[PDB]
Design a protein around this ligand. Structure first.
Ligand code: GSH
Length: 85
């Protein structure tokens, strides 16, 4: 698998998502994640929701295998229905 982190909240609560992906990339030994800056690549909150395929307005966004998940709790959920059950 491969995870991507798009942009930043800064809010500790949401940041749990990034921490989670990273920690998971210690717990599991296949899937790398990568973090990506909207400030480097130049992507809007609009773009994000466009590409994501829905009006996501919470941040961060994390994609897994090029698929938009959503925020922290989405990412927990996705790792559930895919891996943890
Ligand atoms: S301030 C951080 C907020 N995002 C998240 O925490 C990620 C998803 C969480 N499930 C949450 O939203 O509950 C955020 O982006 N807030 C924007 C704002 O409306 O405050």
């Amino acid at each position: 698998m491969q995870t991507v982190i798009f942009g930043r909240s800064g809010c500790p609560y949401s940041v749990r998502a990034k921490d989670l992906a990273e920690k998971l990339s210690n717990e599991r030994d296949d899937f790398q994640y990568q973090y990506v800056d909207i400030r480097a690549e130049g992507i809007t909150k609009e773009d994000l929701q466009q590409k994501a395929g829905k009006p996501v307005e919470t941040v961060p966004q994390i994609f897994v295998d090029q698929q938009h998940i959503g925020g922290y709790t989405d990412f927990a959920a996705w790792v559930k229905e895919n891996l943890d059950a």
